[PDB]
């Protein structure tokens, strides 16, 4: 019984920034979601399919993990229909969502003494992302009528902007690790069961 690898997602070392969220696929194995759920060491565990129990006994053809780190006050953005920086320009869910979201505080692990500047989000973007899209483009933003062509300055800003995760910040500002486990069901051998 080759258990599906989840210890290499939730127990990973370096979650990528929210604009370059680490996507992984799970297939051709079995996973015990219930043991992860009943761990209780998770801040939020919100499911938009079925409850943690009954999702074990519904075999699926693929399970996509999407891992990153965001701010506490913006965790409440990660759900279909929400709007904001994350929900528009960094990681947008669809309104037909199946799967669910698992998030927990990682203050100590991810906060530096003076606040780590490793993480980023696309603060500037013309149009919001389509659902599940990715956009890692690092071109300087085109703010208004006049271009500047790669010279960072007025009316054209480097869209990516960092996080000041000081180890003293308010809990709404301390980083939280987030993983979206999106199930999917297709016309194929369902190789992810319980």
């Amino acid at each position: 019984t080759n258990l599906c690898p989840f210890g290499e997602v939730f127990n990973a070392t370096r979650f990528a920034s929210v604009y370059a969220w680490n996507r992984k696929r799970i297939s051709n194995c079995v996973a015990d979601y219930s043991v992860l759920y009943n761990s209780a060491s998770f801040s939020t565990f919100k499911c938009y399919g079925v409850s943690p129990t009954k999702l074990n006994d519904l075999c699926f053809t693929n399970v996509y993990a999407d891992s990153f780190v965001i701010r506490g006050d913006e965790v409440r953005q990660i759900a279909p229909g929400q709007t904001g920086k994350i929900a528009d320009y960094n990681y947008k869910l669809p309104d037909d969502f199946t799967g669910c979201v698992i998030a927990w505080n990682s203050n100590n692990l991810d906060s530096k003494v003076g606040g780590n500047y490793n993480y980023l989000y696309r603060l500037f973007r013309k149009s919001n992302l389509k659902p599940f899209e990715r956009d890692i483009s690092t071109e300087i933003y085109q703010a208004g009528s006049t271009p500047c062509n790669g010279v960072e300055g007025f009316n054209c800003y480097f869209p990516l902007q960092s996080y000041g995760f000081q180890p003293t910040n308010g809990v709404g500002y301390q980083p939280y690790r987030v993983v979206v486990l999106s199930f999917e069901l297709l016309h194929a051998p369902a190789t992810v069961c319980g």
Partner: antibody
Amino acid sequence: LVESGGGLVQPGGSLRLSCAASGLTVSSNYMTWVRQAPGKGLEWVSVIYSGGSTFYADSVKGRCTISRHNTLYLQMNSLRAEDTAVYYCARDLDYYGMDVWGQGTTVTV
Amino acid sequence: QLTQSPSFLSASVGDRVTITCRASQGISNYLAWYQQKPGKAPKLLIYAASTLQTGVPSRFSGSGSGTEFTLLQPEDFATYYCQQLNSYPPLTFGGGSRVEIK
């Protein structure tokens, strides 16, 4: 720079205000609406995103922001007592702050 | 959260004054400093710490759950505001100490 709009009207009448860009088009910037009551600090009554999503405050939660091309609009029906104040345009750089503002304009019940 | 700033200050001309605002619990980079001269739309001064274009004589910042700025030139008979940056639903402003010169 920017531009002002209509002034004092009746109570709970269809209040409306407008704004205009000067050298920076309104399709790509976090446009705003900030309100200062006469004899009070500042507020924040609306923000309009580049993608189109809008946000309002607790008070004046029924306000309707808008965007088009470069004639920014804000509207409201329940022009209650708090509506008597001055309002300002501003483009936001959420890490760099409320940048250049309009001249602002006043309205009263 | 809520932000509380100092009261009004009566200062002497050509003297460096200091204003401060303490935040509820933790901001550490998300505070901006603004100038409102009476009858005029307010003008920003300060990012987390940096300064934009003009206030070179009135730039100072020390932000960790309680920030403070330091500004002198007798053309500062106006009011100073602190706006906390990323609280997306409310864009809460400070109590806004005003300075007079004497």
